[PDB]
């Protein structure tokens, strides 16, 4: 890749600079280069990878929704709205495929600790979910099942190996609940998962330091925010 000649440590340093500069495409390219060095990622490095791509795909998702809404209104002016929505959609799919490619080659298979493996399987579920948001053809069901499968494996590991307040476990459950609500069209499963996750975390907060308490309650509030909208 175009980052092949740069040192791993320099790529990490520049990813952190890119984050400070709000240059998220650069940040993602630097972290992709770091992954392609072939070494496992530390906790901080995994978070840099995720933050970078989350910001890139987030811009694409927001743009796609704007264009999709305009397109739907135009169907209630020529091919241009569809063409441009398709252009953004294809770039979004490309980013998701890139992330999934990094996870499959070879981040997941080398991830043995729960904190790394759950993190990567959650990401796999997330990027299949972003693909599902735009999917319409004969593969939509298979994309949805790929998201479900990744989230389910992550859930199974997280429940065996992490406390119920673990922020990775909490963010996984949050995202899987949203998958249920609006991708799988299982709102009851979404509500049940969010409630059970919130309540089991509540009951474990007493074990935490002040700093860990803050980390866990931040994500618990996101579960509550969704439950308030859903019930």
């Amino acid at each position: 890749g175009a980052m092949g000649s740069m040192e791993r440590a320099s790529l990490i340093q520049k990813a952190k600079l890119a984050e400070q500069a709000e240059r998220y495409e650069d940040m993602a390219a630097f972290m992709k280069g770091a992954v392609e060095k072939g070494e496992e990622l530390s906790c901080e490095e995994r978070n840099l990878l995720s933050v970078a791509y989350k910001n890139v795909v987030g811009g694409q998702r927001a743009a796609w929704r704007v264009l999709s809404s305009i397109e739907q209104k135009s169907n209630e002016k020529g091919p241009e709205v569809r063409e441009y929505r398709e252009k953004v959609e294809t770039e979004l799919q490309g980013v998701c495929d890139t992330v999934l490619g990094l996870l499959d080659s070879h981040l997941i298979k080398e991830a043995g600790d729960a904190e790394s493996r759950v993190f990567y399987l959650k990401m796999k579920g997330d990027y299949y979910r972003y693909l599902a948001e735009v999917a319409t053809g004969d593969d939509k069901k298979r994309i949805i099942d790929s998201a479900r499968s990744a989230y389910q494996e992550a859930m199974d590991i997280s429940k065996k190996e992490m406390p119920p307040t673990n922020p990775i476990r909490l963010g996984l459950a949050l995202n899987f609940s949203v998958f249920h609500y609006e991708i799988a069209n299982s709102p009851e499963e979404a509500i049940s998962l969010a409630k059970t996750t919130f309540d089991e975390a509540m009951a474990d907060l007493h074990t935490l330091s002040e700093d860990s308490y803050k980390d866990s309650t931040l994500i618990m509030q996101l579960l509550r925010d969704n439950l308030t909208l859903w019930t």
């Binding site: 989350k54 811009g59 927001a62």
Partner: peptide
């Protein structure tokens, strides 16, 4: 579209 809360940067 109404977007629900998911983990990490709310970048969309």
């Amino acid at each position: 579209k109404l977007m629900f809360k998911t983990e990490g940067p709310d970048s969309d």
